[PDB]
Design a protein around this ligand. Sequence first.
Ligand SMILES: [Ca+2]
Ligand SMILES: [Ca+2]
Ligand SMILES: [Ca+2]
Ligand SMILES: [Ca+2]
Ligand SMILES: [Ca+2]
Lengths: 377, 50
Amino acid sequence: ANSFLEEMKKGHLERECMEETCSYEEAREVFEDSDKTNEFWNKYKDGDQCETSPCQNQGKCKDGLGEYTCTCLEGFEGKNCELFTRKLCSLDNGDCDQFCHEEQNSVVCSCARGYTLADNGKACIPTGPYPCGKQTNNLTRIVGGQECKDGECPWQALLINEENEGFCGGTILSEFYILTAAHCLYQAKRFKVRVGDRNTEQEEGGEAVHEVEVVIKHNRFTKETYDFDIAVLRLKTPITFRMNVAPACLPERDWAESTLMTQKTGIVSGFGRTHEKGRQSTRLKMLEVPYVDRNSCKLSSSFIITQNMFCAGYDTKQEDACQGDSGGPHVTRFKDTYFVTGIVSWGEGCARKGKYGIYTKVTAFLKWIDRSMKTRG
Amino acid sequence: QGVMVEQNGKLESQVEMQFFSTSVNAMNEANAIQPKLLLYSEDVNMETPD
Ligand SMILES: [Ca+2]
Ligand SMILES: [Ca+2]
Ligand SMILES: [Ca+2]
Ligand SMILES: [Ca+2]
Ligand SMILES: [Ca+2]
């Protein structure tokens, strides 16, 4: 065991540790390490656990003092690696990059416009040269805003009136049709579209101007209660997708309500007012704010809040968009790609304590948006 | 036998503990690490006269 002279030499794994109690120590000087002593010792109190072969499908067997630990292959769970794990949309998006499905106790991935599925069964194909959803102490009223990096905000669409002063932000859908707020049209009977605007006064030559052809707006809109504020306008000249002009990925009606808007954060951008009673902003701006729950959304506003209204922003941090930002791009960065979420209409003031900026649900309008292309496309 | 050192004009000692503990530490359990052998350690002016 641990007698005198005995341990005045060196241990032997047959001499001592077997016919003897083999408490430890003498079980550990034979190797002098950590690699084999634990595993070896674990099998003499009650036996070895990998004798029984408990784990399934080549699941690695790890012994221990009274337990076996399994480390299986890819996609295996359970006590003995007997459970064949199911991949779901909730369980890691079904491994799909952008669009997941839960088809018959499995996941079959699809993709959005300009995207197909490769042979791997999970990852999409950015067919389009520039696929949507990728990034292609100063005073004086910078309300936490960020200047967009070159190509960082390429879906930025702008609506310009007669007098050369663009007002409403927007998300660039495609070459022909441009989404906007329904009441952004109330500003004038005539206005045009200029895309790629980043600085109106200093020109780099990288802006594209497309005339507005036909008005496709909302029918049941309310000019007081701000119910159903959304519209669609057509471009006369197609947008050749390039670094400053890239589309934004359109999610699906169900999918953006199950995963996309259930994420914590989003991005707010536009060309409206920086603050209440403030001035216009020329440099292309963007903002970073998270999404908050509905149970605090009703108590915020003084209108009637219905299922088409959600709250996004901070009660404390004072960085909120203002009038003129209606229709602006309100996107969320998904696993690897942007997908639009909100469309601005109004706000009970701008940057008020306990209040939120109002955005209309894009997925509650995506079936509306997709209807817009197959009627007069 | 601890050497002395003058601080503030007064002689003071320098001996300082050195707690210690099992090496089986290396096998299971945790903060269960308790102490088991305090050695006191100091300094002398050793001579070997003859
Ligand atoms: Ca030994
Ligand atoms: Ca033997
Ligand atoms: Ca022996
Ligand atoms: Ca013996
Ligand atoms: Ca020994």
